[PDB]
Design a protein around this ligand. Structure first.
Ligand SMILES: *C(=N)[C@H](C[C@@H]1CCNC1=O)NC(=O)[C@H](CC(C)C)NC(=O)c1ccc(-c2ccc(OC)cc2)cc1
Ligand SMILES: *C(=N)[C@H](C[C@@H]1CCNC1=O)NC(=O)[C@H](CC(C)C)NC(=O)c1ccc(-c2ccc(OC)cc2)cc1
Lengths: 305, 305
């Protein structure tokens, strides 16, 4: 076929989104069993987010101060607690649409689908990678907080991300579903540095394998290299160094296409220091690093759920 | 925020996908009310697709020759008919998950979401434009036929596409939900020409507006132009000519950003004949034409469903 950035089907996550209102602040919550999960800054006014003391702010809130709405039907809140940067609301009704689910903390370079939501209603779905510097390059307007990132394994939804804020550079930051931020970020309206981002080398190689499978072969060169030699050029171009663990993850793709990983590194090497000369690869004029080796295999093998 | 290629949430379409088996051929069908829709080449063997006589082939088929499966539950087929290149199977049960829906035939340049499916099970979702030459640049493996393209307006699903085949260039071709192909294509395994594709000019301009809204402004130039002058360069670069209808569609974006459409054309003009000099716009080194002016407004205004 061809190759597109593909999100997981979002139906199972759609059935879990609700609207959470505290005071005049509304955002999105995730309703699983009899618990609703949402960012704790739902309790902040505009003035509060400059420097919030979340413990002090939450003490002024009671259960009935939290309005939780799914569709035109509301849940009754019978308990609340704050875990790290997330707030957990105990409701009197278990979500009849709860899928089989898990909470996972992903690693940098891994990918996931985002269901962007407003007022508890789904708006769109897109695919994201967790950058090495633990930001994501999303698309998020005011009110999008509480939108969640997830993967699906057959029938099981692994939630890995919930959106909390945008950085000065315009990239996005958030937490796992236990409320622990990815990266060194805090939920406060203050200027925060993400630090140098780097290109996910193993993902770029997976994509070059995807290119070969789909007929794009012009970049295949006549050289080879070593891991240390390639990593010398990786460092110069802000690419993650490649390890034997990464070569092993690329192994299935190597063995299907007959191109040794160190040969694919030599092709990438020449691309890095000679550019693309105005050509394209899989329809892009840049090297794409937001497909994992697993994503490539899924798309080229037609995995279903 | 930022700007990504965004698909509609797919939950409403997920509830409509089934598996259709005739003989040893299996593909995807769309179950709406008590009718299942699927490509008519479900009735073909491998040898049949070289030169099929679909009327002759279908006459040998009875209702009970069609196996329709949703999950581990099956539908009983009580009628069949062929409309253009689609087959309609009447079943004894109306889909309890049928959304409010409509069948629409889209225009070239319009966009839609694709729910790629295998064996009746959803695999992923991505966003597509109908090219001016009536192909789509999808991602489709064997067994993906019957996967459908759609848009969503609040609660109503507009089905516009169902996948039938891949072309020699690797692009994809299919029908509306009445079985009429987009483009000059036929459902036969024979070499077919799509003809010269061209770049959707109004979509490129919408994306340049999206860039300005999201902080990318370097391409804003000091020149202007006229419609005829711009179209002279559009023709040279295989861009659709721009009409007053297109300027009018761009009007809301013009009036929000304060950039006259003819000024944005002059910037695009210089980009076309001077290139991007190795810079990027919204993270791309190419001019993107698969966002409509409506898609830009939706993403920058947070439309929900
Ligand atoms: C959830 N509803 C929103 C989602 C964000 C809105 C716009 N795009 C988004 O991703 N979350 C919030 O508004 C956050 C609330 C706090 C309590 C975490 N805050 C922020 O998203 C935020 C924006 C900007 C800045 C910032 C940038 C630059 C400088 O100096 C140059 C200072 C501060 C901080 C926090
Ligand atoms: C549905 N299950 C598939 C989806 C396609 C499979 C692989 N990628 C796809 O999009 N549909 C089919 O296989 C079609 C059945 C007929 C009856 C429409 N046929 C084709 O998809 C097809 C592939 C290739 C060619 C072809 C290409 C080049 C040349 O000469 C250079 C001749 C023929 C024709 C049809």
């Amino acid at each position: 076929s061809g190759f597109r950035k593909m999100a997981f089907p979002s139906g199972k996550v759609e059935g879990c989104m609700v609207q959470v209102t505290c005071g005049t602040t509304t955002l999105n919550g995730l309703w699983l069993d009899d618990v609703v999960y949402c960012p704790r800054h739902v309790i902040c006014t505009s003035e509060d987010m400059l420097n919030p003391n979340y413990e002090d702010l939450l003490i002024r809130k009671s259960n009935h101060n939290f309005l939780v709405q799914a569709g035109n039907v509301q849940l009754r809140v019978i308990g609340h607690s704050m875990q790290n940067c997330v707030l957990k609301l105990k409701v009197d009704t278990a979500n009849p649409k709860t899928p089989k689910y898990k909470f996972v903390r992903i690693q940098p370079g891994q990918t996931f689908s985002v269901l962007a939501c407003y007022n508890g209603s789904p708006s769109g779905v897109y695919q994201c990678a967790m950058r090495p510097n633990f930001t994501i390059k999303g698309s998020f307007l005011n009110g999008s907080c509480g939108s969640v990132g997830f993967n699906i394994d057959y029938d099981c939804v692994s939630f890995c991300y919930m959106h909390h804020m945008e950085l000065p550079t315009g990239v996005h930051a958030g937490t796992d579903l236990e409320g622990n931020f990815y990266g060194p970020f805090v939920d406060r309206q203050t200027a925060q540095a993400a630090g140098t981002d780097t290109t996910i080398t193993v993902n770029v190689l997976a994509w070059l394998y995807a290119a070969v499978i789909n007929g794009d072969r012009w970049f295949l060169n006549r050289f080879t290299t070593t891991l240390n030699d390639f990593n010398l050029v990786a460092m110069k171009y802000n690419y993650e160094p490649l390890t034997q663990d990464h070569v092993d993850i690329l192994g299935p793709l190597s063995a299907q296409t007959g191109i040794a990983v160190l040969d694919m590194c030599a092709s990438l090497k020449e691309l890095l220091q000679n550019g693309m000369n105005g050509r394209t690869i899989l329809g892009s004029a840049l090297l794409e690093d937001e497909f994992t080796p697993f994503d490539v295999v899924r798309q080229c093998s037609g995995v279903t759920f």
